[PDB]
Amino acid sequence: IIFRLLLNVLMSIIAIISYQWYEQLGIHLTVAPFSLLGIAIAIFLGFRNSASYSRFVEARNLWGTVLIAERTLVRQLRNILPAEHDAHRRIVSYLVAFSWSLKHQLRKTDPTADLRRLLPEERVTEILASSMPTNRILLLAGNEIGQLREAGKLSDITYGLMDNKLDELAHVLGGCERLATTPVPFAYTLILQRTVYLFCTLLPFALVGDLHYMTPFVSVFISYTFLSADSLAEELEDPFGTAANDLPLNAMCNTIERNLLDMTGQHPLP
Amino acid sequence: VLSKIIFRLLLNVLMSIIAIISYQWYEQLGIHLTVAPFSLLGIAIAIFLGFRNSASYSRFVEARNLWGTVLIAERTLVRQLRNILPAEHDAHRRIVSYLVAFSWSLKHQLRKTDPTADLRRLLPEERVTEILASSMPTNRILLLAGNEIGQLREAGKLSDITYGLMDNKLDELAHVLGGCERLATTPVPFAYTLILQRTVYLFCTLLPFALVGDLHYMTPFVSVFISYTFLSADSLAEELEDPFGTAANDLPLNAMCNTIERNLLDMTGQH
Amino acid sequence: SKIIFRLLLNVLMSIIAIISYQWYEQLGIHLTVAPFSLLGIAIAIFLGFRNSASYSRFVEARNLWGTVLIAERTLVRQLRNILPAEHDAHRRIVSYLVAFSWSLKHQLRKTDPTADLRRLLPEERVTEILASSMPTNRILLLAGNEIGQLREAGKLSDITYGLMDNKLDELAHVLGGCERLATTPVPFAYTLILQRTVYLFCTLLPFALVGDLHYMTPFVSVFISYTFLSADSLAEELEDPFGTAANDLPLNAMCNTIERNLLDMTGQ
Amino acid sequence: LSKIIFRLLLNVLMSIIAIISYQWYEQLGIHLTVAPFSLLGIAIAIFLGFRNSASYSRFVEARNLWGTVLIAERTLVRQLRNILPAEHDAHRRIVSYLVAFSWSLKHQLRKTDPTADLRRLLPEERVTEILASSMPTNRILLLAGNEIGQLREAGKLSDITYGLMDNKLDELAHVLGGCERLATTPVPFAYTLILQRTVYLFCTLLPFALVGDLHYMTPFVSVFISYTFLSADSLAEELEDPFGTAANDLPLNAMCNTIERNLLDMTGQHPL
Amino acid sequence: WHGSVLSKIIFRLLLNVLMSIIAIISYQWYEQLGIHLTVAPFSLLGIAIAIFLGFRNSASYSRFVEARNLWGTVLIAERTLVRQLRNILPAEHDAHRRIVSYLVAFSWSLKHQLRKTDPTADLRRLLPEERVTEILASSMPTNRILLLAGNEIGQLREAGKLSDITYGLMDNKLDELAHVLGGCERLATTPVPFAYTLILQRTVYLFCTLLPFALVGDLHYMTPFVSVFISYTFLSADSLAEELEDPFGTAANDLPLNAMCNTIERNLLDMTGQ
Ligand SMILES: [Zn+2]
Ligand SMILES: [Zn+2]
Ligand SMILES: [Zn+2]
Ligand SMILES: [Zn+2]
Ligand SMILES: [Zn+2]
Ligand SMILES: [Zn+2]
Ligand SMILES: [Zn+2]
Ligand SMILES: [Zn+2]
Ligand SMILES: [Zn+2]
Ligand SMILES: [Zn+2]
Ligand SMILES: [Zn+2]
Ligand SMILES: [Zn+2]
Ligand SMILES: [Zn+2]
Ligand SMILES: [Zn+2]
Ligand SMILES: [Zn+2]
């Protein structure tokens, strides 16, 4: 980014010294065409940011739903089966493993320490064996519920009430996968990013006639505004990207683990 | 804050007086500032402020909506209790005290304030202790109300279906909780508003210099008009920053909690 | 409206600007068009977004009222389909749904619902309803009681009770939503600063145009002013959809439509 | 394109008047620069952008509601086949009500006579019942609901499976409600008609402010600009009524025909 | 950046450079004629066109996003239908395998239908020939696949191995898929209103044709270069709608439906131990 700003000031000085030689040749750059162009580019950057922002908000809503559905499902297990503490403890394990597994899957990092921390090793091997480990964890949680239903402890209705929450988590997994696997067609976005780059390099040659020595200052102010618009659009396109802020994901996984522990009577020391 | 915008309006007037005074020296030295580049930059900044303001506004509308749903789902949970168990008035009173405690607690959570007093007013001390030990008191309150209807289900007074009908309302509330906690911890990205406010400040400070060649002694008036408009647009979005905050523009959470409590008390024959 | 005033005041501002154009440079004041281009275009962006929010606020009100008709229609359909012989319960529940609509309309218009309520319900319930600070919620509660006593009497199962309970929820979200809209406006900081800015812009504009247009200034200025005043006025015009203005929902017509729909479904 | 080409060539006329009256600008003392009209024209374009957004939202919603007719009717028939596979007389009756519902909804939105379509589909007794209601699409929904209600009363459906079908009837009621709200409530006219008149006036005055610059080009760029602006305006006006009959409105007859072909796919036959 | 669109931008860009040459070597006979073109009207026109392009392309992009989302729902709903089968009927593997083959068949059939290709080989790889016959005799084969999966769980309900409740839990997923099928068919028959794209392509075409005659008086010999830059911005922005016209198509920025169907199949096989 600062490379393009500094390249901007040097095309500014090139513009200044080169300026007047080409102009008497009949080589003119005026401000009005570039103002037409830049206003068009700015409108497109508004919309492109709107889209990227939507993708960011969607990632945040999906994770929020992890917290809601996992909270609600443990609430249901306590309210409906208060005495099945072993089942509570097992299911809570799978729910926390699911959150961490999801975060590692999206960020493309190794889930093995979190899995091995939370789950028996037979099931950690079953999970790491699958090419879709988060989905497998959802399956295993489903098995705990379905076993409680075979054993008579849940009816089909209360089983159904919890099955809904496992559907809420399946909705989260697929949504996050789509958000991580494919970004908005950059087909238009790359074309627009290059147009922005060319616009900012040519800008000093369009401004020098008006601003003389002030050309590099105003030129980098304008170029800075535009390049920030384009780069924030790039950063928001990609909530799970390789250079993303991992703090709110890490914070979300920790919050839900703390909630489920504090919830099952395991958080407050005896 | 109003003091920021009047103070930087102040400063803009100053800047334009510097621009007026120094214009004579401006042309010999090689400096020229024309209006057209600042028209391009200003229109772009305005486009970006439109979109950002749209983000802020929609954050504030969502916060108001979530609270609307607190009132809706709590009203109908009490309605289901009365319609399904007309005789079970002890459960009526206890669940109403948990729903009311949930609302006040949500307010305290969002406001980062201590809910001990409201809890003690509505609940027996043992439950207050249980709720305060939790890292999420509103969650523990939803769990306790759920124990009320769950015990009703174990006594055979609720079937699995009517139990489930009320359980869903505790779902409507968990989603409100998640929504509010999400909004609280997820602002409009700081890069946006910080870069935007730096750009607006620099833009307004530089503007009178671009105006002076054209307006001469009119530079301060026009410059301050334009700057007022822009500083208004920028500050308004950060004035919708925390809808759960304390300020004239922020949601009146205390009044809304009183409306909720009044509603739930009205529905259970209480004064 | 205040538009015709501000337009005439704009004509006067423009005449002043013409007659005062002489002493302009004598005073040292120079005013071009380009700064006002910048500012007017920005104001117009902000007005387009603002009017957008106002518009969506109006749309949501029309939608909430649309859901009343949908949910009461299908609660009645479920009554006739699940208990086709229970006409006395038909009449009681329909009178509650219709009363809910008119009560909602009166509460939003801040009028007394008593005539409609007593026209629809027994006095014994009407007093319970108006004894409450939330009459429309109380009416929802009572309709719930009709359904619930049907369930206790074995006439509805828990399942078919639940399928009607869901429609009661559809109406609770409508009530809460309308009450929210009625007390939650698009932040009037928008509208106020924007309106002042539109006005000051409209009065200063001819002084910035006279140097370039001379005697033509009043026409271009009134045109531009009309456009900006028009947009600002529309945002103020769509702010309260539940009111009685020409641009507001025909709430009375809508309540008549709901009531005739449910009476047609019940033979009555 | 009836009104708009009339106004386009009327704009060629106004440009010609502007040209031959540029003769008199020097002597009458009238400058008319382009910058004030660029400002005003950009404001008008912004408002036309937003207005087209509102119109497009109405049109996309209308299209979606109709898509929900096909989805809900399809799954209701599917449930009837999966739950009561042998009840073909019920199959046929309910399907006839649902197809009737599509056509009835279309005629209601278009304000046309449904009698023919109803008669092609249902017995004449039910046709007169439906025609007697002032809400015939709603009455058709009530009648589909009576078919399901009977299947329940006869013990052929339990309350669960009855409810699974009742939900789809609710999906159709939200469609009816949504179309009625769209067809009877438009976008307010403080926008539409003040903005439309504003666009007209701007277009007629533009060439007068452009002769100063373009002299004989002013009819060409004036007509170009009026083309794009009048297009924006009339497009918004067309799409705000998406159940209308303009060329850019929804093809409701093709949608009803698709729905019919679906539910009656191979004389209504289906694998057990 | 695919076939039919790129050809048009290159041609209109060549049209542009040529119009700019003519403009340059003919500007000298302007004021003598009375034809004059200034930048300011074309700034008005260009900025109006750009606003309308912004809105339009916002529609096109939303349409692409919806197609992607509908396909993601296929994955989610089939995943959970299989999960439910395992958790409610764990011993009923035969039924598991049949229902899985119908769900995979549904995905492949939806791909073929949206590309208008022949589903017969995929269907015969997944299903017994009688089933393929039933499916392909329908005028709506993918919907018919849904009806057959409904029959599988309906038989499970008849045999008492599913209660009405749990039968209903899987029925809701079958109409999670019915929502997908209707949505794809609607998108496939409902573009962004062609009036938008056609009028926009025309005003952009004319605008880019007249631009160099409006820029020449300012830019002299620079006219071709920025005229082609500006024309690039407008032409490619106007091309976006056609790029995103066919999200179910086969181009590079067209959705990767075959890999998505492969992924769905691998997911269900993984879930059922095959
Ligand atoms: Zn426990
Ligand atoms: Zn699901
Ligand atoms: Zn802890
Ligand atoms: Zn509710
Ligand atoms: Zn939930
Ligand atoms: Zn009570
Ligand atoms: Zn009756
Ligand atoms: Zn009676
Ligand atoms: Zn009264
Ligand atoms: Zn559906
Ligand atoms: Zn049949
Ligand atoms: Zn409904
Ligand atoms: Zn001439
Ligand atoms: Zn198996
Ligand atoms: Zn393609």
Numbering used by the authors:
A (entry chain E): 24 to 293
B (entry chain C): 20 to 290
C (entry chain D): 22 to 289
D (entry chain B): 21 to 292
E (entry chain A): 16 to 289
Lines from the paper:
Although the structure of hBest1 is still unsolved, two Best1 homolog structures, one from bacteria Klebsiella pneumoniae (KpBest) and the other from chicken (cBest1), have been previously reported. Overall, the channel is a pentameric assembly with a single ion-conducting pathway, which varies in diameter along its length and is constrained at two narrow points: a “neck” contributed by three residues (I62/I66/F70 in KpBest and I76/F80/F84 in hBest1/cBest1) on a transmembrane helix, and an “aperture” formed by a single residue (I180 in KpBest1, I205 in hBest1, and V205 in cBest1) on a cytosolic helix.
By sharp contrast, cells expressing hBest1 W287A conducted tiny current just like untransfected cells, suggesting that, to the opposite of W287F, W287A is a loss-of-function mutation. Therefore, W287 is an extremely sensitive “switch” of the neck. To understand the structural bases of these mutants, we solved the structures of KpBest Y211A, W252A, and W252F at 2.6, 2.5, and 3.1 Å (equivalent to hBest1 Y236A, W287A, and W287F), respectively. Although the structure at the neck region was surprisingly unaltered, possibly due to the molecular packing effect in the crystal or the presence of Zn2+ in the crystallization solution which might stabilize the channel in a closed state, all three KpBest mutants displayed conformational changes on P208, Y211, and W252 (equivalent to P233, Y236, and W287 in hBest1, respectively), reaffirming the mutual influence between these three residues. Taken together, we concluded that hBest1 P233, Y236, and W287 are critical residues involved in channel gating at the neck.
